Design a protein around this ligand. Structure first.
Ligand SMILES: [Ca+2]
Ligand SMILES: [Ca+2]
Ligand SMILES: [Ca+2]
Ligand SMILES: [Ca+2]
Ligand SMILES: [Ca+2]
Ligand SMILES: [Ca+2]
Lengths: 329, 329
């Protein structure tokens, strides 16, 4: 197992200024570095309290990279549908070099209707836009004199600068909450995968992993634990009932932001290992269950939410580092 | 006068790898901070050794912001013609908050044919895309529930997140199109201007400044020296021979890059005060001339070029801070 942190903002200006949010998030990235976490992840979203403080994850991750030395930086996930592959390839290549080779690039599908409407892009061909965006970026990184005759963009021969630091390029992961068939296509392409256990049933995530691992082997490709990412809301306290109360409020706040942006329950989610909330001992048992179902992979611990004090996010990370990180290292 | 540092890359891998360039440029930003320079600036350009290591200046400046405390971060310049105003406003708002209000945003006009070709933008739309892009971004920062229905984009109502740190928005500077209307339009909107003395005759710069200052007065706008930006190649050494030879190589190399991209001169440029290269006493005389011609404004000192070692860029900056910065303070 690998464990990093995810910094998904679910907050609006009435709860926390963006100035405070970004100072706190960069300090949590520093704490991830100091405590020995694997990575720092953030997201791309527009307009709503659900994710909207992060319309450009690369901008945050370049700052996080500059504040850190060893933690990896991960997009979870850039949205190729809303950018141009020349720009996406270029800014990610800059970040790879700034971070001295610590970047992993997750690419995801958009789903918020207001994002599609505002950028005047149809959902109808978003799948083709996504696949062509990923491949065009990969080609801009891997090749020179690139002639891209795409459905949505046509350019070349061109060679994108800067060239990436990593060879052939940063790891590519494809996010799928949608369809196990997209996980098969990722393996066929040699890509990693990002799954969403917090919404999908356990047996569904397992069958997606089985299809992915099967397709990967058929393509002569052995996925490591760094090729499979999943994010979990995470809140730790020495008092597990305090963790339930404050972590449950956080998960509630994020759920509400989500419901607004798309246009008993918490305890069951915790019992089903859809969220990592409790004492270090509760979360240890939960992780061991997850590892038994899914095998070894990379978890991003989502540690911020709403007006949750920085000190509580930092406590979660410190407790995880002291009590859990050593046993999986 | 104010003096900052320009970190425009005119460099390819035979001179510095991208990894070396970004490591050294971030250290120069740290040195600009330490030595008391006003700002750090970088460019947006694609494909060529002329600027092509920086397809996304916000990515670099986010890292530079994270490494520094006081120096301002200036886009010189983002190109609205190649990015959607929603994305431009969002990433810049993130950068504003990450830097805790140290951002000034210069908006530039593209001119390299290869960039227009690759992004599939007709050059005849350059003016409208620029003016509509700048204004849409300004409104996205300044207002809530923004609806924009222009020639190229239609969206809203949206409230762009994160909200900027600076209110109503960061300083906006615009490259002028040498037509009088563009300098007057900047003044009437309360924008600053970015002028190019290294290429245009002194009298042209003076005419644009007169138009800008007069239109500002008529509009009730009082521009300050921080509202007027110009870049100069800069190389200082106490040995005047070394300054001319190495500063000359640096400027000639940058001019070769530009000539490739668009398809006794250096001595003349220095004599006409279009480059700031020489001993500290020689450059002092040059700046005194420029200030007499143009008034007080903000200079970005372009201190890197090609394979010039970091320590020579650092020496230029240290000599400038010791011998010239106090005379204008
Ligand atoms: Ca603080
Ligand atoms: Ca090659
Ligand atoms: Ca080095
Ligand atoms: Ca400039
Ligand atoms: Ca103003
Ligand atoms: Ca300038």
């Amino acid at each position: 197992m690998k464990f990093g942190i995810n910094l998904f903002p679910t907050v609006g200006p009435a709860e926390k200024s963006a100035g405070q949010h970004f100072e706190e998030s960069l300090r949590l990235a520093e704490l991830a570095d100091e405590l020995g976490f694997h990575h720092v992840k953030t997201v791309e979203h527009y307009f709503h309290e659900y994710g909207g403080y992060s319309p450009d994850p690369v901008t945050f991750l370049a700052a996080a990279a500059a504040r850190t030395r060893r933690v990896r930086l991960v997009t979870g996930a850039v949205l190729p549908v809303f950018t141009h592959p020349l720009k996406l390839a270029g800014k990610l290549a800059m970040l790879d070099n700034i971070s001295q080779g610590r970047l992993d690039v997750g690419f995801g599908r958009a789903f918020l209707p207001d994002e599609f409407t505002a950028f005047e892009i149809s959902m109808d061909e978003s799948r083709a836009r996504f696949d062509e965006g990923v491949e065009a970026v990969r080609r801009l990184w891997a090749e020179e004199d690139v002639v891209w005759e795409g459905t949505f963009h046509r350019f070349g021969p061109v060679t994108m600068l800067p060239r990436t630091w990593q060879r052939p390029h940063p790891r590519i992961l494809v996010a799928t909450a949608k369809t196990p068939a997209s996980a098969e296509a990722a393996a066929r392409a040699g890509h990693g995968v990002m799954l969403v256990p917090s919404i999908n049933p356990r047996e569904q995530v397992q069958k997606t992993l089985s299809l992915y691992r099967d397709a990967a082997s058929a393509a002569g490709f052995k996925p490591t634990e760094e090729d499979i990412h999943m994010s979990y809301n995470c809140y730790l306290a020495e008092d597990g009932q305090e963790a339930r109360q404050k972590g449950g409020q956080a998960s509630e706040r994020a759920n509400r932001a989500l419901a607004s942006a798309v246009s008993g329950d918490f305890d069951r989610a915790v019992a089903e290992r859809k969220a990592l909330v409790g004492t270090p001992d509760e979360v240890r048992a939960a992780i061991d269950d997850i590892r038994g179902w899914f095998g070894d992979f990379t978890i991003s611990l989502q540690v911020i939410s709403g007006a949750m004090p920085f000190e509580e996010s930092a406590r979660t990370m410190r407790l995880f580092a002291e009590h859990l990180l050593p046993h999986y290292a």
